[PDB]
Amino acid sequence: MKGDKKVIQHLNKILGNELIAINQYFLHSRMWNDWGLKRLGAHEYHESIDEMKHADKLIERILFLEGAPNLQDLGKLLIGANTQEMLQCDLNLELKATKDLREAIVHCEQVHDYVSRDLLKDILESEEEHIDYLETQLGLIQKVGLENYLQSHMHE
Amino acid sequence: MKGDKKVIQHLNKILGNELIAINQYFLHSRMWNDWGLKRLGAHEYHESIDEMKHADKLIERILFLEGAPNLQDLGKLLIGANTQEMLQCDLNLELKATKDLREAIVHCEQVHDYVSRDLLKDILESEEEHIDYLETQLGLIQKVGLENYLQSHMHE
Amino acid sequence: MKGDKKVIQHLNKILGNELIAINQYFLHSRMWNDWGLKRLGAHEYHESIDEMKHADKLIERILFLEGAPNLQDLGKLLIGANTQEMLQCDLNLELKATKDLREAIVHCEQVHDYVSRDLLKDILESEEEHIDYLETQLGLIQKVGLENYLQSHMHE
Amino acid sequence: MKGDKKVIQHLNKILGNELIAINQYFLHSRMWNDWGLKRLGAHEYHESIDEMKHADKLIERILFLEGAPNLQDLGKLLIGANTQEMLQCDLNLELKATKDLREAIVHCEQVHDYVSRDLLKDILESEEEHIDYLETQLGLIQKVGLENYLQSHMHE
Amino acid sequence: MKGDKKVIQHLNKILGNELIAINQYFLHSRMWNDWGLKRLGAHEYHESIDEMKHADKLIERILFLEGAPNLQDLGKLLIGANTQEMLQCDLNLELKATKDLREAIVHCEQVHDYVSRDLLKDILESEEEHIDYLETQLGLIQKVGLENYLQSHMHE
Amino acid sequence: MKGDKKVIQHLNKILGNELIAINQYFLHSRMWNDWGLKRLGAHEYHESIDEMKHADKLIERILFLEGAPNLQDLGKLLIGANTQEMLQCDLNLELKATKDLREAIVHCEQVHDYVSRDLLKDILESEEEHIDYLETQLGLIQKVGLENYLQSHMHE
Amino acid sequence: MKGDKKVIQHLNKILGNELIAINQYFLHSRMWNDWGLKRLGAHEYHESIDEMKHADKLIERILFLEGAPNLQDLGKLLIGANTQEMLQCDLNLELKATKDLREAIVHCEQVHDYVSRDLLKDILESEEEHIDYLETQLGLIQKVGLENYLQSHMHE
């Protein structure tokens, strides 16, 4: 079905953010597992999988709308050197992603692509849950202390 | 069955205390959940449900006794800003509530409303369990340290 | 995540309508039970639970957006003295509440809080089902007669 | 297999009556449901489904006989404004349908299309059960009174 | 264990009331069954059984306290002539019986017979439930009309 | 609940498109079954049932909003003579129908009928899935050849 | 455990090839699904998943060896425009990848990193299986014809 060219460009931009998130979260997950922080690693792995699922739905929609999904252009991964930085790197990524999602939704609405809008709203709800998770972890580090917070995420 | 007018006023006063506790504990539960302290949040939620059940029983008794349950007047909620304050606010409210229950029970005994006395003694048993839980939590914060106490209440 | 201050005001206004509904429908449910109209009583109880779940979702959203849920201010309960009045009182409250939901949705759209919009739309769908239930009951009272209508709602 | 042109014309005429009944009865069903008369609504829905099944068998037989099923021409729906009128509209429609079925059966017999006759006879049996149902409800309204009759058909 | 003579007197007085209610409710039950009002007859039968269980517990207590249970003196049965009168007769009996229960509890409390007091409170709780049932049925007759009320209690 | 008159006109217009599609796809389904192309006939039957479900939800929404569902007006069925034409006729109907859905949604949004908007968006999502199916089949005909495509849809 | 720097370089080079293959195959899978060639789509999906698992193991080994996995430098995706081109692009990628694997294995053997050699040998077995699959499909296209080959891969 012939889609709006600007919508497709937006969909491809959201896809680009997912592809960053996939790799960033996967690496952070394996870094935490490597350190023995297996509960943090397991949770970060599931964040990664969520983004893989987002990317898949974006790819399917771009192809239905007769555009070309861009999986070639991989933007800058934000890799931290410790748990506190890793969480904040993820949270910086998510905040930038939600800004792009909101702008894409505005454009879908303007050209009446309501099905793409709905897809993007679904992704956005998930990213806001991710933001909640990240803010909540950083807040817990402050309330319980870094050492306790890491202790609590050693064993699954 | 026409009840004693002052007994009914006592029952409405107990009901008013229940309505404060429902809202205060429900908000505290959701604050704890929002902070990622989900074991505290789940326990406070069950305390809130406990108060909803007390209110229900009082409402039904007031109606049986041909009174008018007052769900309109909501007294002051005591909303803490951190875990220590939230526990102490709940404890302050429980202590005021039990004082009112004791006076209601004196009046029921005086006019021979033994069934209302029984209902109020059941509520009071529950309130003293609530007090024991709150006092114990505050005690545990001093024995294990606030950061340890909060750590132990992160995960269900 | 930092929410829009006027969206948060809108959410607290919707929450305030929910808190009226919880108390109004709970009291009506227990009044119908007390009269032995158990089928009305049970249906109204489940309406009350619906509103408790709406309030919980609003409370959680407000807190995520870093606002303060307002559970302190309780508006006017509309309590009737018979089945016809109680149904019309509920219907009056739902119509007022849907007006506030629509204005809140307008604001969420204006500032691109699409997740809050979605949540309010979900609540709005529920309220329109509540309206449909209430209008239908008032219509059945006209079609079958009041005494028949009440007879059919005596027994669960 | 090449059918008789006038038989196929008869079959298309019966189908056209089925198409009126599907729509008329589906609308009456949803109106009854809308008014909270859910037992009437459910039973009319099932009458609707029966007519859909009649239409299906007629379409398959027309195509086997190398005819062209006519789903384009929709005759006049008879929509009532209250229960008594809706039942009478349905009955009026059934009685016209059975007149057409009988004439179709005569023609099938005359040209030895015995399998078509058998299908039409099966449909006619169902229409006569529909007629019995409708006549019987109208009699019950008279015997038990309209308000009682509607009361008995509120709840499934 | 030697009981207080006046407590035992009180218990025999309560037992006397139980014996009236057993026969009164049993007869009313069989009258309603005989008339084909089986739902009323079944519920009245269960009230009779309740009173039989009360009598059993009073007999057992009197014998433990080394008194002599009095099953010989049967007070006046109030037998109604129609459903309304029968419910009112039952309600008159219950209200008179709760008056004697309260005076017995006062005396139990006065001589520290706290176990007998607890037994009488449990009975009194059952009697207020019986009162609620009877009051509610009389109220339902007013709200739905006598003929509707009886119709709804023909079939179990 | 009194709805917006132009919204109801839009819903009745969507309903009109559903009624065309019901009959068109049902006839196409039975044509495919009659030719022994049973996998195409079964899938087309399921499209037809999807449309009946859309029609049902529209009818229910129109009645709730106190409008009059129009099941009387049946637009022009596009009936093809072979598989390729039938698929294109269906595709042409869907593309016309999504146009009317988009315009109906614009109007719902403008008058704040957010529940009607959500219902139409759900229908639109389904229609775009239908378009995807149709376009894909026409594409497979080109990629595998007509004879291979038909062969693959003989047997369920 | 400190690993050989040049081994880690080899592992990151292998990882770079996995990352290309993941994206290329995932996009080829979804292109096939979009065209209705769903057997090809599912199989290419599972190839993509295989590469994700190769990547994971490489990432884990690199971290264990105190290296930094490189997920940032995504090489050129080879995207075909039709089934034959897509298969050949995949085969070209696999053949380049196996040459890098053989060179990495030589180096692991030279420095006695026999655990790394074993992991690479397991990956190599899988790539050779991937090569066999792809060569076989290209051969079948020649033996059965392109249209037959695609036909056979439409339905799962």
Ligand code: HEM
């Ligand atoms: C460095 C890049 C990637 C890595 C390491 C990776 C890793 C993984 C792993 C380990 C799994 C679980 C496989 C299993 O054991 O079942 C998985 C699943 C999956 N991947 Fe990836 N992945 C990557 C990139 C991608 C991309 C770019 C996409 C899509 C565009 C994607 C789509 C999926 C999907 C759909 C699943 C299955 C999710 C489900 O459970 O439903 N992946 N990935």
Ligand code: HEM
């Ligand atoms: C007059 C005030 C209230 C009364 C009498 C009341 C009563 C009740 C009762 C009887 C239950 C079922 C408890 C059980 O047996 O499990 C319940 C459940 C619940 N209440 Fe309340 N409630 C009140 C206010 C509230 C408020 C203000 C909120 C939230 C802001 C709330 C949230 C809930 C929730 C979430 C549930 C569980 C619902 C479920 O089953 O999923 N309630 N309430």
Ligand code: HEM
């Ligand atoms: C106003 C037009 C129509 C409406 C609203 C309607 C509605 C429905 C609904 C709601 C169902 C149940 C679907 C499910 O939940 O599985 C159904 C089933 C069905 N419909 Fe219709 N329908 C319409 C027209 C037609 C026509 C014109 C035909 C045939 C000529 C037809 C044939 C069927 C058949 C065969 C079934 C399956 C029934 C069974 O075996 O249970 N429908 N319809």
Ligand code: HEM
């Ligand atoms: C001193 C007077 C009476 C006492 C203490 C007494 C006690 C009891 C008790 C303890 C039961 C068992 C109830 C249960 O736990 O389910 C019972 C059952 C019953 N009683 Fe009595 N009762 C008395 C008089 C009567 C009378 C006067 C009638 C009838 C005219 C009656 C009719 C019945 C019946 C029909 C049952 C059910 C027995 C069954 O299971 O078939 N009772 N009674």
Ligand SMILES: [Fe+2]
């Ligand atoms: Fe995402």
Ligand SMILES: [Fe+2]
């Ligand atoms: Fe396509």
Ligand SMILES: [Fe+2]
């Ligand atoms: Fe834009």
Ligand SMILES: [Fe+2]
């Ligand atoms: Fe969605």
Ligand SMILES: [Fe+2]
């Ligand atoms: Fe995310």
Ligand SMILES: [Fe+2]
């Ligand atoms: Fe955690």
Ligand SMILES: [Fe+2]
């Ligand atoms: Fe360990």
Ligand SMILES: [Fe+2]
């Ligand atoms: Fe309480």
Ligand SMILES: [Fe+2]
């Ligand atoms: Fe009462």
Ligand SMILES: [Fe+2]
């Ligand atoms: Fe007092």
Ligand SMILES: [Fe+2]
């Ligand atoms: Fe008790």
Ligand SMILES: [Fe+2]
């Ligand atoms: Fe309490």
